[PDB]
Amino acid sequence: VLRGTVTDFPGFDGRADAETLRKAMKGLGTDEESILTLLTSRSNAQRQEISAAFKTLFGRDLLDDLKSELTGKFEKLIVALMKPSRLYDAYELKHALKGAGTNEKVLTEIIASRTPEELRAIKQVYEEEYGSSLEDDVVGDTSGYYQRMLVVLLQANRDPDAGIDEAQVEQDAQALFQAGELKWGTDEEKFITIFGTRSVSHLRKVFDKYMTISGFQIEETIDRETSGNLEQLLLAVVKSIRSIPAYLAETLYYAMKGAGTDDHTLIRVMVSRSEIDLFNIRKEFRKNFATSLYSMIKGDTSGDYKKALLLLC
Ligand SMILES: [Ca+2]
Ligand SMILES: [Ca+2]
Ligand SMILES: [Ca+2]
Ligand SMILES: [Ca+2]
């Protein structure tokens, strides 16, 4: 069952909260600790009510005020909290597509881990907000089978979980076996349909059967955690069919491991999942990585940015 770490604050008063925030901002400087503790303990819907209340009481726009007063990764994190939950994934998608080049990592990550229902809603908001079709901007920025696989997934049309046709489980585990042995370089079209179109429970049975045929897990054969956009996507889909919290816990782990931090991914997964499954991601993190998410964040981040992330966690 999915559990998030941010819920609605009981006893919420949008007006009183807008006043605290005004007082924190107003005058020389800023009180970041006041902003930080309030906005991490109100849900996203309550933050939208605070923005509305701030504007009725003061005629000032709350988010421009926050962008004025805050700086750096803390500012980026607060701005991300303030994005309406329904617009945020579409916002991240638009910013990976836009401009020169493209950030394929955010593309793989959101399209492979969002459910068909989330994707239909995202496609809708993206159009409404940006005028173009998510699909046309994706096609405009990606090439090859990576492009094809993304479009397949963007159709939000996986089969229903019902007819476990074990003959087609058999059949599909064979195709993937043969494809794995050829390093996913030969019959792309066959396996893009299997990974994009089958039901989640069919593909779980297919992944079990693959292992019984080969002796190893299917991600062993696709395991190049770098280099090759299609392979990175195949890996994100296999991982998300098994468990979307486990896959998102893993991208968090790799955002902090080594020199530096991928603060954009750390902010994106912490914020986008705070009210969906961040608790499940936490449990998966500890289980698969033998460290709690809190402790890795704490050693990897500093200042008010750290304080706010630890309160979200
Ligand atoms: Ca000020
Ligand atoms: Ca200050
Ligand atoms: Ca681009
Ligand atoms: Ca690091």
UniProtKB/Swiss-Prot annotation:
Modified sites of kind N6-succinyllysine: K287
Crosslink position(s): Glycyl lysine isopeptide (Lys-Gly) (interchain with G-Cter in SUMO1): K26
Annexin repeat feature ranges: 12-83, 84-155, 167-239, 243-313
The organism's place on the tree of life at top rank: Eukaryota
Modification after translation, per record: S-nitrosylation is induced by interferon-gamma and oxidatively-modified low-densitity lipoprotein (LDL(ox)) possibly implicating the iNOS-S100A8/9 transnitrosylase complex.
GO BP, one annotated term: blood coagulation
InterPro entries for the chain: Annexin (IPR001464), Annexin_repeat (IPR018502), Annexin_repeat_CS (IPR018252), Annexin_sf (IPR037104), ANX5 (IPR002392)
UniProt similarity note: Belongs to the annexin family.
Name this polypeptide is given: Annexin A5
